[PDB]
């Protein structure tokens, strides 16, 4: 049992001063140090009066297998980016060996993230995710728009799903991902989602990431048309959007990106057990614009980085700074608070892990970070945490101090 | 004489490969290494094939005297920020002693900036600027809206101007700043600008930084009205905007911020010898929105950080990343190129220093930075320089390698 007394606790929803946190695997109590030592005489008190305690981040959406990318994939424009993934994945995947994956996951923990949603396309990241101290939801992604090869795509997905499922534990959950509404045949999506239903898996899907997708699925025209004709010899979209979206009605689904979603889609998703995953850097760098947060206000959202295939880091502090800037007209002190809540509590809710809040009964998944100097208004704390922090001093996962440095469960 | 052969040179306007740069104080030649050694047999060739050469940045607008600020001033809203400056400047100024100023200027050089525009309100930064290896335009700022005390404000400005002018050299130029159209009486502005005219000084002015300023100077109403009534016992704006703007017609002026400028003002400024200084982080963090670059396309602009009074760093790489994000719908590969040009060449043009370009006859004010790995499309270089760079490996000012580490002229 340990007691930490920081300058303040971000819960994240509230700022608590003059209290400490008692924790072992879970957060056991939040009270004055004097009260806590009466209850927990075996817990040494650690005073960190120049530090803040907040939950570990959840990063519910990243593509680990692409972690070798720095400047190989084409940024600025979504269809050219996609062509570059197809052209270069055979080079990039082998470059990210076990050392690349280990280093990447360690970097994630060292920057204060304690839970992730890993989108896995080939299963090459399985061993790294089961070894990692991070809590991982491991989304086995299926892709394929051609009915002729749907059996093969399903077989691959099924094998990967079962290969991952044998490793489940408190820090590893097997899950299902549908690549998108343009790239997965309806019948293949349905069969993969039947597996999710059978096993009670979380589901993730990229939905309305680009205007090209919007126009292709609405009209069968636009920038995707050349891509589908050239690469796939397809002349029209394989899925009706409404029919595809209906497949998710009985599942807990992460709808990722959502930049180009329309009002009907948003109303439908609001009626589901669903979260939106907002990836501001990835959307901006791939020429996809910015998610309008007011339009999706009926649906909870969380923040993620996407992979290094469309981002220059997996540091959630960097993602949160970018989020402040791509929504530049949102008043900064209040929006920083919203962002910190969405990056902790909301992301943990999206992943279904018990954490993301400094609250009794939650796993002690926590970050200890430097207190920004010269603070005059405690309400400004959330903004200054985003602006001045790059990495925590300590990171706890289930009460275990992993960054003190152990990166493996 | 030295020759450097990098992987590529950003001029900044063009990408040159397969050539090296010969330089002493100035850039002497740009040619193949084979040709350069024929011309400069005394210059050892340095091969840096995993690096890029680009000009040192200009940062034409910063408030050094406020470099102690981290979380003391109020962010999010401009009038509250201004109240906080008034409330806390007596605490913040003394905290930034010579060590604070020395460390700040050293940090500026270490992040690849080689020329600055220092806005000085009290002259407390004079010694640091004359000592610094940086090229500095030292803008002696005047403020005061009350006619009754204009004589005192002018006397202070004049003394500071003359105290700075005695130190002029290739790396230090004395200049004049007018705080703003709301805070400087017309007659005080005119008298300060007469000094600029007499001595041929550059001029800087904050212009249309906030909507409050826009409404106050258009209508005598809005958020500034409470401020002027309470702090200044003034009930209407002291200046007619058009009359105030006319004062700058014969000068070379840096118009800083410009977020809320109107079409008439922009047309007028376009007819002047004038540059706009774009400070995206400061504008965003103080609840002032984002400068519309399309509306000011008739006027050249440069990028600056403003002071640590409204920014979390003075690193131009960070400013450029923020610029990418606050203009999130500008295609990234082309906009990154625009930004690099505006941060080097345009800022040097604004400050009137000979530099900001890797071109024969220019001072060798240069940065050597890491080449981003795995590049497939050389045209993407500008974007990857902004995304992946935090500090250069080497920084040259007039050919002298200051970052290799010497911070003093
Ligand atoms: Fe993704
Ligand atoms: Fe300023
Ligand atoms: K794990
Ligand atoms: K100097």
UniProtKB/Swiss-Prot annotation, chains A, B:
Give the required cofactors.
a divalent metal cation
Its Enzyme Commission number? 3.5.4.40
Pathway as given in its UniProt record = Quinol/quinone metabolism; menaquinone biosynthesis
Q: What is annotated as the active site? A: 209
Query: Which residues are substrate-binding?
Result: 141, 145, 179
The UniProt note on the cofactor reads as follows: Binds 1 divalent metal cation per subunit.
Q: Name one GO molecular function term.
A: metal ion binding
Its recorded reaction(s) are: 6-amino-6-deoxyfutalosine + H2O + H(+) = futalosine + NH4(+)
Source organism superkingdom: Bacteria
* UniProt: a divalent metal cation binding residues: 61, 63, 206, 306
Q: Which UniProt keywords apply?
A: Hydrolase, Iron, Menaquinone biosynthesis, Metal-binding
Q: Which GO terms describe its biological process?
A: menaquinone biosynthetic process
Which family does the record assign?
A: Belongs to the metallo-dependent hydrolases superfamily.
Which function does this protein serve?
Answer: Catalyzes the deamination of aminodeoxyfutalosine (AFL) into futalosine (FL), a step in the biosynthesis of menaquinone (MK, vitamin K2). To a lesser extent, can also deaminate 5'-methylthioadenosine.
User: What name does this protein carry?
Assistant: Aminodeoxyfutalosine deaminase
What is the scientific name of the source organism?
Answer: Nitratiruptor sp. (strain SB155-2)
């Amino acid at each position: 049992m340990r007691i930490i007394k920081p300058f303040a606790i971000l819960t994240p929803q509230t700022i608590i001063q003059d209290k400490a946190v008692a924790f072992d695997k879970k957060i056991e109590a939040i009270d004055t140090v004097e009260n806590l030592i009466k209850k927990y005489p075996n817990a040494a008190v650690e005073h960190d009066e120049n530090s803040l305690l907040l939950p570990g981040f959840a990063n519910p959406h990243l593509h680990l297998e692409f972690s070798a990318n720095k400047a190989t994939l084409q940024y600025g424009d979504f269809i050219p980016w996609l062509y570059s993934v197809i052209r270069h994945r055979e080079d990039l995947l082998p470059l990210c060996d076990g050392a690349c994956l280990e280093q990447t996951l360690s970097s994630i923990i060292q920057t204060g993230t304690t839970a992730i949603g890993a989108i896995s396309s080939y299963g090459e990241d399985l061993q790294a995710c089961i070894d990692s101290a991070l809590k991982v939801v491991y989304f086995n992604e299926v892709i394929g728009s051609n009915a002729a090869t749907a059996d093969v795509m399903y077989a691959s997905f099924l094998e990967r799903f079962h290969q991952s499922k044998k490793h489940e534990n408190e820090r590893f959950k097997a899950a299902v991902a549908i690549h998108s509404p343009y790239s997965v045949h309806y019948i293949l999506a349905k069969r993969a989602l039947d597996i999710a239903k059978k096993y009670g898996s979380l589901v993730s899907v990229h939905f309305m990431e680009s205007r090209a997708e919007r126009e292709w699925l609405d009209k069968g025209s636009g920038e995707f048309a050349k891509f589908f004709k050239e690469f796939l010899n397809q002349t029209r979209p394989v899925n009706d959007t409404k029919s595809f979206l209906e497949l998710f009605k009985e599942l807990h689904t992460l709808f990722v990106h959502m930049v180009w979603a329309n009002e009907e889609e948003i109303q439908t998703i609001a009626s589901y057990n669903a979260h939106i995953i907002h990836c501001p850097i990835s959307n901006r760098l791939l020429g996809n614009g910015v998610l309008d947060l007011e339009k999706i206000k009926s649906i909870p959202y969380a923040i993620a980085t996407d992979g290094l295939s469309s981002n220059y880091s997996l540091n959630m502090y960097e993602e949160l700074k970018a989020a402040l800037f791509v929504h530049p007209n949102k008043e900064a002190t209040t929006f920083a608070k919203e962002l910190i809540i969405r990056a902790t509590k909301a992301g943990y809710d999206a992943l279904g892990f018990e954490g993301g809040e400094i609250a009794v009964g939650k796993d002690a998944d926590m970050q200890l970070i430097d207190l920004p100097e010269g603070l005059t208004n405690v309400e400004d704390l959330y903004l200054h945490v985003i602006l001045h922090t790059t990495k925590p001093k300590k990171v706890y996962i289930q009460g275990e101090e992993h960054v003190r440095n152990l990166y493996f469960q």
